[PDB]
Amino acid sequence: RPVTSPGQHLLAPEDVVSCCLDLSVPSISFRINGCPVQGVFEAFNLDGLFFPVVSFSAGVKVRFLLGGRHGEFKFLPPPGYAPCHEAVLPRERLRLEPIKEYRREGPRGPHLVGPSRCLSHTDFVPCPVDTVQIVLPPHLERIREKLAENIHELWALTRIEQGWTYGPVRDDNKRLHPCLVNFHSLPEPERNYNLQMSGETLKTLLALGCHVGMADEKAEDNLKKTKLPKTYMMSNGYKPAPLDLSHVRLTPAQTTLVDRLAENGHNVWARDRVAQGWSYSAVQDIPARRNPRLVPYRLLDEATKRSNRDSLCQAVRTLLGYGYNIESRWDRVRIFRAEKSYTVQSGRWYFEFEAVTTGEMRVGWARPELRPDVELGADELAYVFNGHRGQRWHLGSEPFGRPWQSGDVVGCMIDLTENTIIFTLNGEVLMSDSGSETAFREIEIGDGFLPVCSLGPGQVGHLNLGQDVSSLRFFAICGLQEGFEPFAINMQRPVTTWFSKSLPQFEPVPPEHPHYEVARMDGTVDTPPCLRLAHRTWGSQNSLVEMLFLRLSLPVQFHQHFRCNRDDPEIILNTTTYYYSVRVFAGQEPSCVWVGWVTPDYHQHDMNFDLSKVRAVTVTMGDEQGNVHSSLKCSNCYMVWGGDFVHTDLVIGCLVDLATGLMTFTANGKESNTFFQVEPNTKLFPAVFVLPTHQNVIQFELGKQKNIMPLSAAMFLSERKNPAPQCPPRLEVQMLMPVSWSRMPNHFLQVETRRAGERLGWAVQCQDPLTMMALHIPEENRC
Amino acid sequence: LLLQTNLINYVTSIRPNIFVGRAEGSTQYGKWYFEVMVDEVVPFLTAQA
Amino acid sequence: GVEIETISPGDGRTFPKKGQTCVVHYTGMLQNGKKFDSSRDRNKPFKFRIGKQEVIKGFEEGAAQMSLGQRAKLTCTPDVAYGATGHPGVIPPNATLIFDVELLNLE
Question: B5 in contact with C at a CB cutoff of 8 Å?
Answer without folding.
Answer: no
